[PDB]
Design a protein around this motif. Structure first.
Motif, PDB file in Angstrom:
ATOM      1  N   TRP A  28       0.824  -1.192   0.000  1.00  0.00           N
ATOM      2  CA  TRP A  28       0.000   0.000   0.000  1.00  0.00           C
ATOM      3  C   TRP A  28       0.863   1.249   0.000  1.00  0.00           C
ATOM      4  N   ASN A  29       2.065   1.108  -0.508  1.00  0.00           N
ATOM      5  CA  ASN A  29       2.996   2.215  -0.574  1.00  0.00           C
ATOM      6  C   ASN A  29       2.924   2.867  -1.944  1.00  0.00           C
ATOM      7  N   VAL A  30       2.709   4.169  -1.964  1.00  0.00           N
ATOM      8  CA  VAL A  30       2.650   4.899  -3.210  1.00  0.00           C
ATOM      9  C   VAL A  30       4.049   5.329  -3.588  1.00  0.00           C
ATOM     10  N   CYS A  31       4.667   4.550  -4.452  1.00  0.00           N
ATOM     11  CA  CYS A  31       6.015   4.828  -4.894  1.00  0.00           C
ATOM     12  C   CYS A  31       6.010   5.577  -6.210  1.00  0.00           C
ATOM     13  N   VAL A  32       6.600   6.752  -6.189  1.00  0.00           N
ATOM     14  CA  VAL A  32       6.688   7.594  -7.367  1.00  0.00           C
ATOM     15  C   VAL A  32       8.073   8.182  -7.477  1.00  0.00           C
ATOM     16  N   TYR A  33       8.411   8.656  -8.654  1.00  0.00           N
ATOM     17  CA  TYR A  33       9.724   9.224  -8.866  1.00  0.00           C
ATOM     18  C   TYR A  33       9.679  10.723  -8.648  1.00  0.00           C
ATOM     19  N   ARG A  34       9.884  11.105  -7.399  1.00  0.00           N
ATOM     20  CA  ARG A  34       9.824  12.491  -6.988  1.00  0.00           C
ATOM     21  C   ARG A  34      11.182  13.143  -7.201  1.00  0.00           C
ATOM     22  N   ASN A  35      11.229  14.067  -8.165  1.00  0.00           N
ATOM     23  CA  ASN A  35      12.463  14.745  -8.587  1.00  0.00           C
ATOM     24  C   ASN A  35      13.621  13.765  -8.777  1.00  0.00           C
ATOM     25  N   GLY A  36      13.305  12.597  -9.327  1.00  0.00           N
ATOM     26  CA  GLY A  36      14.327  11.618  -9.641  1.00  0.00           C
ATOM     27  C   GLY A  36      14.438  10.511  -8.610  1.00  0.00           C
ATOM     28  N   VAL A  37      13.946  10.756  -7.408  1.00  0.00           N
ATOM     29  CA  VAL A  37      14.069   9.783  -6.329  1.00  0.00           C
ATOM     30  C   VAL A  37      12.768   9.024  -6.143  1.00  0.00           C
ATOM     31  N   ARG A  38      12.872   7.711  -6.054  1.00  0.00           N
ATOM     32  CA  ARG A  38      11.707   6.867  -5.873  1.00  0.00           C
ATOM     33  C   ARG A  38      11.220   6.949  -4.429  1.00  0.00           C
ATOM     34  N   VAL A  39      10.154   7.704  -4.239  1.00  0.00           N
ATOM     35  CA  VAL A  39       9.614   7.990  -2.923  1.00  0.00           C
ATOM     36  C   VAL A  39       8.318   7.210  -2.713  1.00  0.00           C
ATOM     37  N   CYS A  40       8.101   6.703  -1.510  1.00  0.00           N
ATOM     38  CA  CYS A  40       6.895   5.942  -1.228  1.00  0.00           C
ATOM     39  C   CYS A  40       6.210   6.431   0.044  1.00  0.00           C
ATOM     40  N   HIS A  41       4.894   6.565  -0.027  1.00  0.00           N
ATOM     41  CA  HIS A  41       4.094   6.954   1.128  1.00  0.00           C
ATOM     42  C   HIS A  41       2.881   6.054   1.254  1.00  0.00           C
ATOM     43  N   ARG A  42       2.400   5.905   2.471  1.00  0.00           N
ATOM     44  CA  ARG A  42       1.359   4.926   2.773  1.00  0.00           C
ATOM     45  C   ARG A  42      -0.023   5.428   2.381  1.00  0.00           C
ATOM     46  N   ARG A  43      -0.764   4.585   1.674  1.00  0.00           N
ATOM     47  CA  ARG A  43      -2.138   4.881   1.309  1.00  0.00           C
ATOM     48  C   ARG A  43      -3.015   4.891   2.551  1.00  0.00           C
ATOM     49  N   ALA A  44      -4.057   5.696   2.512  1.00  0.00           N
ATOM     50  CA  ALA A  44      -4.974   5.822   3.633  1.00  0.00           C
ATOM     51  C   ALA A  44      -5.909   4.618   3.710  1.00  0.00           C
ATOM     52  N   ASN A  45      -5.413   3.535   4.287  1.00  0.00           N
ATOM     53  CA  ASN A  45      -6.169   2.296   4.377  1.00  0.00           C
ATOM     54  C   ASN A  45      -6.078   1.717   5.779  1.00  0.00           C
TER      55      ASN A  45
END
Length: 45
Positions: A28-45
């Motif tokens: 449930w981790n939202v992994c995206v490429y934030r300014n080049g870095v693969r960042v992950c944040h927890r979904r509201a579940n």
């Protein structure tokens, strides 16, 4: 051509019956490429 990159998400739809751990805090981790870095944040579940 058929791409399997995301197709694996459809494959594990069958294995998603084992979602006991995936009920909260498995994939449930939202992994995206934030300014080049693969960042992950927890979904509201």
């Amino acid at each position: 051509r058929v791409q399997g990159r995301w197709k694996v998400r459809a494959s594990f739809f069958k294995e998603a019956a084992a979602k006991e751990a995936a009920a909260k805090g498995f994939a449930w981790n939202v992994c995206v490429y934030r300014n080049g870095v693969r960042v992950c944040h927890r979904r509201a579940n």
